[PDB]
């Protein structure tokens, strides 16, 4: 985790050793699921490319540009998440449900 300082067009990057990041997986499928929409931001096809993580966002019901009573709002800090410093790491496992072979 790094901090950026700017003054007089000078730009300084330094380590902030006590800062954290937060990571959680949505295991119970309680959030709008945006992955199957074929967006950008996937891991690069070439292993030596460094990539930027895409911003998360979601849509809900509307009438025009206006919300409706059913349209829902989600705070993602209302989920338990794991906080990690530079020494910490994150891991989880997942098993696919039974699905028919793709026919190649």
């Amino acid at each position: 985790v790094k901090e950026v300082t700017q003054n007089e067009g000078t730009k300084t990057i330094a380590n902030n050793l006590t800062s954290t990041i937060q990571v959680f997986t949505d295991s119970e499928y309680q959030l709008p699921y945006v992955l199957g929409s074929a967006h950008q931001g996937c891991l690069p096809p070439f292993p030596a490319d460094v990539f930027m993580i895409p911003q998360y966002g979601y849509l809900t019901l509307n009438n025009g540009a206006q919300a409706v009573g059913r349209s829902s709002f989600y705070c993602l800090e209302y989920f338990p998440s794991q906080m990690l410093r530079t020494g910490n790491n994150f891991e989880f496992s997942y098993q696919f449900e039974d699905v028919p072979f793709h026919s190649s």
Binding site: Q30, L31, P32, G69, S72, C75, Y78
Partner: protein
């Protein structure tokens, strides 16, 4: 298509009848079926009990959901209650879809 649960083996049909009680026969034999019966009806109580399984709402939504509510404002009659003459009425259809989910 009207609604509810399709069932291959639904709850069975329950059929009830008053057994016919004939009036006095002729005292000389006749083959014709007896057409003269005592007028009867029957009354009683019927009790039915269903156990329903519920699927609880797991939603992580922040803002409050729409609920089914009784109107707060005053009225001559209570909704879903008898009136002055004593008859019960249902003022509106009540559907089951209020809470929300994500696709």
């Amino acid at each position: 298509l009207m609604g509810g649960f399709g069932l291959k083996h639904p709850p069975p049909q329950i059929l009830i009848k008053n057994t016919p009680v004939p009036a006095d026969p002729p005292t000389t034999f006749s083959q014709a079926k007896l057409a003269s019966f005592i007028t009867q009806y029957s009354t009683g109580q019927v009790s039915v009990e269903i156990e329903w399984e519920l699927q609880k709402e797991n939603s992580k939504r922040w803002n409050p959901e729409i609920q089914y509510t009784s109107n707060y404002y005053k009225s001559t009659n209570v909704d879903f209650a008898v009136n002055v003459d004593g008859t019960y009425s249902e003022p509106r259809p009540i559907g089951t879809r209020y809470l929300t989910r994500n696709l």
